[PDB]
A paper describes a structure:
We identified a N-terminal truncation of Mis19 (residues 51–112, Mis19C) that was capable of interaction with Mis16. The crystal structure of Mis16–Mis19C was solved at 2.0 Å by molecular replacement using Mis16 as a search model. Mis19C forms an extended tether, which is able to bind two molecules of Mis16, one at each end. Residues 56–63 form a β-strand that continues β-propeller 7 of Mis16 and stabilises an extended loop from 107 to 116, which is disordered in the Mis16 structure alone. Mis19 then loops across the C-terminal face of the Mis16 disc and then forms a helix (α1, residues 79–97) running diagonally across the edge of the H4-binding pocket. This helix leads into a short loop, and finally into the C-terminal helix (α2, residues 99–111), which sits in the H4-binding site of a symmetry-related Mis16 molecule. Analysis of the structure shows three main contacts between Mis16 and Mis19. The first (site A) is formed by the Mis19 β-strand and proximal loop. The third (site C) comprises the C-terminal helix that binds to the same binding pocket of Mis16 as H4α1. In our Mis16–Mis19C crystal structure, two Mis19 molecules bind two Mis16 molecules in trans, with sites A and B binding one Mis16, whereas site C binds the second molecule.
Centromeric chromatin in fission yeast is distinguished by the presence of nucleosomes containing the histone H3 variant Cnp1CENP-A. Cell cycle–specific deposition of Cnp1 requires the Mis16–Mis18–Mis19 complex, which is thought to direct recruitment of Scm3-chaperoned Cnp1/histone H4 dimers to DNA. Mis16 is a homologue of the human WD40-repeat protein RbAp46/48, a well-known histone chaperone found in a variety of chromatin-associated complexes, whereas Mis19 seems to form a bridge between Mis16 and Mis18 with its N terminus binding Mis18 and C terminus binding Mis16. Current structural and biochemical data suggest a model in which Mis18 provides the principal link to the centromere, whereas Mis16 is responsible for recruitment of the Scm3–Cnp1–H4 complex, which allows Cnp1–H4 dimers to be inserted into chromatin as a prelude to complete nucleosome assembly. As expected, Mis16 adopts a β-propeller fold, consisting of 7 WD-40 repeats, with an extended N-terminal α-helix that forms part of the histone interaction pocket.
Numbering used by the authors:
A (entry chain A): 15 to 162, 174 to 418
B (entry chain B): 56 to 69, 74 to 112
The structure:
């Protein structure tokens, strides 16, 4: 055990040195930054601004804290000087707008710091109104903030990490927690003042999982479809218009071990992915739901993080306690490989990011750039990276 | 206060829906081919190459 800890800390040090040696041959962009507090959550906000007179743009990240002691917790918005490194994403013609260099200097400042009650287990901006952010906080309360608390959502009896807005019904929110419950909420920001904290109770509670509910997501094209995954090893599809006492119209024994994440494809309405403690990502056709489409193998430990590319239908990212973020290309499924190439894994494993030296907490695809990801680990390090276009183009 | 480990500028110049039924068959067919080629071999291929050389 002492020897295992010695060996693990040794292995990680060697891996990180080997990674740094190969970064020039793997990425078009790598940015690292030591945060003052570690964050459990990350999400890019939708906005990008080209800064006149500079070689960068300003893009923003939603972060949180988890002090877990007698220190104050905060919801944070960080502002990143994202260097102009891509001819395709920046209008360079006004030559006040310069191209960035490897010698340049770029900063990250905490642009907003809002006191938060408890660990920030997860934070998501409302898609229809990006100034509104929901969090999962102390004891299972969820909180709503207007960044330009406004509400507290009481219903959960244990902390939770599942939280998702409805992209087709503004202010509709779903949450899932370690109390085995999923709560639905109607958050009307009209009510918001600035003085008082409004207390909201759920519009519905689902008692359909028999263990911790780890993740929920609404279908991007159906305002009544909610997907949930749980430590009870099920993926469940709920029709929010139906009687909550009723069973979920479909219960899928998707894995034989805990399922940590669910991700619905933003372009293909029937394509869904689940990430599990069995070290695997499973793909599903919602029309043919009890028979898995494919298994994405490669991670060496539990898979926790999962997010489709916002730009390319066949591209999927996952993260794992094996300290890797992997990017998969579904179009390569079933191809043949040389024996040497197969040593790196399945052909659909397009790219591996191995820059983190601890458990990966969460990652988020940058919506305003080409193949840019922001990712977090336990040791306060934020990384903003982009694989070489030679690999994905 | 940020470390920039690499920057390589992307110069000027360089998206079809997935059919899920086709993906399912390709997954299953590839699995059949990889059990036949790699799993519990009945002889060592390197043995045959050595004898034929
Ligand atoms: Br969301
Ligand atoms: Br299809
Ligand atoms: Br031989």
């Amino acid at each position: 055990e002492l020897n295992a800890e010695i060996d693990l800390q040794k292995t990680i040090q060697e891996e990180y040195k080997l990674w740094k040696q190969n970064v020039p041959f793997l990425y078009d962009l790598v940015i690292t930054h030591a945060l003052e507090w570690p964050s459990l959550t990350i999400q890019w906000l939708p906005d990008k601004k080209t800064i006149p007179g500079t070689d960068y743009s300003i893009q923003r990240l939603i972060l949180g804290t988890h002090t877990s002691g007698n220190d104050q917790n905060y919801l944070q918005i960080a502002s990143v000087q994202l260097p102009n490194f891509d001819e395709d994403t920046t209008e360079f013609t006004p030559s006040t707008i310069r191209r960035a260099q490897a010698t340049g200097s770029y900063t990250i400042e905490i642009s907003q710091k809002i006191p938060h009650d408890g660990d920030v287990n997860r934070a998501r901006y409302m898609p229809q109104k990006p100034e509104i952010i929901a969090t999962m906080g102390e004891g299972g309360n969820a909180y709503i903030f207007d960044t330009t608390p406004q509400a507290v959502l009481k219903g959960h009896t244990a902390e939770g990490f599942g939280l998702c807005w409805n992209p087709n019904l503004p202010g509709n929110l779903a949450t899932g927690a370690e109390d085995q419950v999923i709560c639905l909420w109607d958050v009307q920001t009209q009510s918001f003042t600035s003085s008082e904290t409004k207390v909201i109770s759920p519009i519905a509670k689902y008692h359909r999982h028999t263990d911790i509910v780890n993740d929920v997501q609404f279908h991007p094209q159906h305002e009544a479809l909610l997907a949930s995954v749980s430590d009870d090893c099920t993926l469940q599809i709920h029709d929010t218009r139906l009687n909550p006492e009723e069973e979920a119209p479909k219960v899928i024994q998707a894995h034989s071990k805990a399922i940590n994440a669910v991700a619905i494809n933003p372009f293909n309405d029937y394509l869904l992915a689940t990430a599990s403690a069995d070290k695997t990502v499973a793909l599903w056709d919602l029309r043919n739901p009890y028979q898995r489409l494919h298994t994405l193998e490669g991670h060496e430990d539990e898979v926790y993080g999962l997010e489709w590319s916002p730009h390319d239908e066949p591209i999927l990212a996952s993260s794992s306690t094996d300290r890797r973020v992997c990017i998969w290309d579904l179009e390569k499924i079933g191809e043949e490989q040389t024996p040497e190439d197969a040593e790196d894994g399945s052909p659909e494993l397009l790219f591996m990011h191995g820059g983190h030296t601890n458990r990966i907490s969460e990652f988020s695809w940058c919506p305003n750039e080409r193949w840019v990801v922001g990712s977090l680990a336990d040791d306060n390090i934020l990384q903003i990276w982009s694989p070489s276009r030679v690999i994905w183009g | 206060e940020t470390e920039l480990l690499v920057l390589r500028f992307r110069e000027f110049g360089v998206n079809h829906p997935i059919n899920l039924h086709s993906l399912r068959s390709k997954s299953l067919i590839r699995a059949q081919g990889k059990k036949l080629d790699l799993h519990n071999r009945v002889f060592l291929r390197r043995n045959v190459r050595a004898v034929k050389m």
